Symmetry: C5
Subunit: 295 residues, 5 copies
């Protein structure tokens, strides 16, 4: 049985059209919760890919292209016990908020989506989404940024500076800010993130230094080879991401990394929503029971 | 018998040189109306092309080049029952304002016209027209932006960011903002919008994510192949546009798309004004009865 | 006998050097007048070319190079009945002011001179002179901008946006702003304005759309082929300019265009200051009698 | 037994996660001291390299890559008598602060880290770390900037201007600001600082002139050939840096330069932390006794 | 017998190090004087070259490289009767101020030094030194700018605009501002100023037009061929500069130009300081008597 009835969607569409003020109102009447629960772990489902022009999972066009299904898959994930929140661009969060599915959940807002997938300028990842001002006003609990560092692309320069400014603002507002770093290179006209252990470590050392106050910054890192060595890179709270996809082996790598010093949980998207098979509720539970061992 | 006598036009010119404050005065004394009527549909005639250096329809030079005829054709459209409003640049609106043609009408203001037609820099569509400040002050009811996304042109970058800023301001002022997205490519030295179903869908996913609050943003989309699939791209209120031209087949495609979830009406220009045959009223009427079934 | 005696120039020099405060003081004690007289026509002499690195008339170096003669020729023009005012950069206006020659005259300030003549960057015409703030404070009556639109030169982009900002400010301050549009192309490494009828029309449609309020904008257009057709381009008050030079034929073309709808007068420089024969007063009077026909 | 225990690091990781406010609080409760002691000399240990993407010492990857060891090595240095303070990016200082290791110490904050090591854009060293605002608020005692001047790289331009702005702010806040100048060139695709006597002198003359008030600016120079001649370049307080590494000869060169007019001490990192032998305490003490001879 | 004793210099360094507040204090306790004396002439010694990376005079490296000798040579010049003041970057002026050599002297601060000598970007002469704010606060009496205009170098564009802004601020603060214009070209990879009569004239016409108020702007021009014709370029107070060097012939050209309309004196550096021989006092007294005929 679907979490969102076609009747609720009629109300959502109908709301944005004639009662736009209700989006913000329902957002603020939202029941808030502490960032960290009793077990100090966090599990967040991500869906900020579309806004960056990335609808693929294994299926290019479809998958994420259909916003109604994206919302349904999200609603399912959020209904499963263990999921603390969601990460999304303003258009995704407002819908979920309007639908009333964000009570007692953690909302993470994606700030920059400028570096569109496949763009000649995707290293110049400009800040096009949430900004601290709107997050503070709306009550989102967490901020997130994508910081891809391409040494041979001048576009990285303005991105490093803009990220530093984002941290300045986030820290000053005492708003936790999640940075997703990567060392990236142009290979055959496409951007490929370097997932080697040393590259990840170098990206963390760089990202950690961005901002005039790094007391509210978290790391969103990829589970890579030799992960206890990558974790010796920072003292900052870290959340793991589940990229491309590959299945049991994937969950196993997370389980191991999840035990490392400083790791506080997961912030996965592509893999949990749109699993290789047809069972979102199942995939989300696995991950969930991996983060919150229900002690 | 023209809706606009040469006397009215004499009064228009004279006023602009003699009583500039009057333009604003007549604009504010304008009778306002609710955005959405009883049937919740909207039909708007567009004429913001000239300011972007695009006077063609099938006739390059002429057509739109003559501002007096443009205004007449507009006056006719606005006089026909069913037309809720007009979309134009400040120069266009001011004239329709001082000519007393704006009663009970919805005014949409074009914001960016920098990406001139045929320019080497037309992907760098800078904000050269209306801004939220002047719209709020003047009382325009709707804001509109052109967001062409060209993955191989760096000019797209600053346009994405400027559009995000426009939405920030529009949302904060609770001013509905209409975004016209497109995926565009350079082909033989000219910019061509990709009207394939998947391109339109990708452009919507990107545009929707622009801004720090997307609770006041609408979509202005082209009627394309497989349109019920394009509409599964957003939950946002959508208005259809009638590009180039082609006639009965055109109206038929609109009629079908007009039934899709979330579609709220039309925002057409080139086709309704400057109809192939000689009758703006007839063409404007055909579309009007398609948007408002006179229930 | 010159309108300005060396004793008077000596004082001008002494003042600037020894008591700069007197320039602004004499400027504000200036007797002001209504923009439009009883016949609603306007005749302004222009001299803002030097600041743009353009001293030629038919004579490259000399002509305008000598500032003292430029001022004399200006003083003569301003002394002839019929001349309502002058257009100049701050350095030209201040001198004419400190010399006490601006009483009961309309002052027009040149805003942008960045696009220097012969520069590889002359399409990037930055705002280097008067700004609305100083004009409002000083009491200048009119603002003027050069808006050359070169479709193949990226420099046009920032110029369009800066011009839009100038109009924003001018309109908000209720300060009339004169835009001089042109379509320009690079030909043999030099910038040449396209004076064909259709190009002028296209430039007007673009310029008219610049700004968030176009209720205070005027047009400064070149007398071109088929001018009653160019005038069907806008409803805005227009002033004619006399470019290069060529003499009786020139005055005749102005006389004809001067009868067209919306044309309010002249804003000529090179041709009346600097006449082929040397008689400024004669040249000026001819022009004046064409503007104010003593009706 | 390490200065920092596993228990304190765990305490740290947990503070950053659940009590982020404690970082700033512990920072402000910090016991402050006068900039210059009784002997007027200063000895500061530097560790702002990681944030710039430079983890090497003789060992590329490792060395600085492990943040926990970096902090330990820092804790050791700070515990040795003679060390007045530390220079670091916000992430480094924050950890030390939380650890309770900055009492009676001088804190210097690295301002720009944009010019990443190995980047095509490393001459465009943007301001990505501490800014005067956060330093004044937090109570850091000193500001530091890297000013590499590459005559053939346009990126130097914005760096010179940004550095000037940093000095403007630092001076206005009466915050001492340390500039590390260098003349740099591209050699075989890599940036190499010119350590010749004349290059260092030229860099000082340039750096000294940056800012609208140079009454709070210090110099951080490299010990080079003919150093009493380099010191005849400025009247400003200078601190010496220990670059690459090379050992006894190194200490000897410092000892000599340390006697020159205007030299006030050391600000060394790579060499004292990460010495060729396994002894941070030994290396640090040797340096400390070179700065404060205990008169 | 040096003007600045070594005990004075030691006191200067010690001040910059432990009492930076004193620099500003001694600067403000400075005895001020009227800009123009009884004879209305002005003689200023310049030393803002180092900050621009230009230490040469005939001797590359040395000459200006030694800041202590530079200050001594300056102290000598300032001690000679007839020298009204000095032009320098903040680091230069502060030292003199702290050394107490600025009483009853005119202080001119150099604003821009970004266009470093030999840089690929030296036409992009950014504002890196004094700004109006700090000059007004400190009490400097005059502002100075270098405005090199290179028609084939895009870097000139931002320099023209930044200069215009400097004049805006200087005029608004009623602070005299000195502009040093030049037409420059790239010749064999190096920047060479065009000293032909017509080029100088063209540069003046351009510079004079920069700013929104040119009632406080002066000209700093080079003594060139046909100088009474160059002076017919402006009505603005002018000061002559002594470039490269060449000796008796040089003084003679100044003496002649010094009689021209509008010329108010000298602002020379390279030549008076570091004379071809070892007689600073002798070179200065010559220049002084030339500007101030003891009357």
């Amino acid at each position: 049985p679907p979490i969102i009835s076609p009747e609720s969607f009629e109300a959502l569409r109908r709301m944005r059209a004639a009662e736009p003020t209700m989006v913000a109102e329902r957002f603020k009447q939202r029941r808030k919760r502490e960032l960290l629960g009793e077990d100090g772990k966090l599990f967040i489902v991500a869906a900020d890919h579309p806004a960056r022009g990335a609808l693929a999972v294994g299926d290019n066009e479809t998958a994420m292209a259909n916003r109604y299904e994206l919302l349904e898959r999200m609603a399912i994930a959020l209904s499963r016990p263990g999921v603390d929140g969601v990460l999304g661009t303003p258009d995704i969060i407002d819908d979920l908020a309007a639908l009333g599915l964000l009570d007692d959940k953690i909302v993470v807002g994606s700030m920059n989506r400028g570096g569109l997938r496949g763009a000649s300028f995707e290293m110049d990842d400009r800040y096009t989404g949430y900004n601290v001002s709107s997050m503070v006003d709306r009550g989102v609990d967490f901020a997130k940024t994508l910081v891809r560092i391409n040494l041979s692309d001048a576009g990285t320069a303005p991105t490093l500076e803009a990220t530093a400014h984002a941290v300045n603002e986030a820290a000053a507002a005492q708003l936790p800010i999640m940075l997703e770093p990567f060392m990236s290179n142009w290979v055959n006209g496409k951007v490929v993130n370097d997932l080697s252990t040393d590259a990840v470590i170098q990206s963390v050392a760089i990202a950690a230094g961005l901002g005039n106050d790094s007391s509210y910054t978290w790391m969103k890192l990829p589970v890579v080879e030799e992960m206890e060595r990558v974790m010796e890179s920072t003292t900052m709270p870290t959340l793991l991401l589940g990229g491309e996809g590959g299945p049991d082996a994937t969950f196993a790598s997370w389980e191991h990394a999840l035990t490392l010093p400083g790791v506080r949980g997961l912030t996965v998207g592509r893999t949990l929503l749109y699993p290789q098979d047809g069972d979102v509720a199942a995939a989300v539970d696995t991950a969930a029971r991996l983060v919150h061992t229900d002690i």
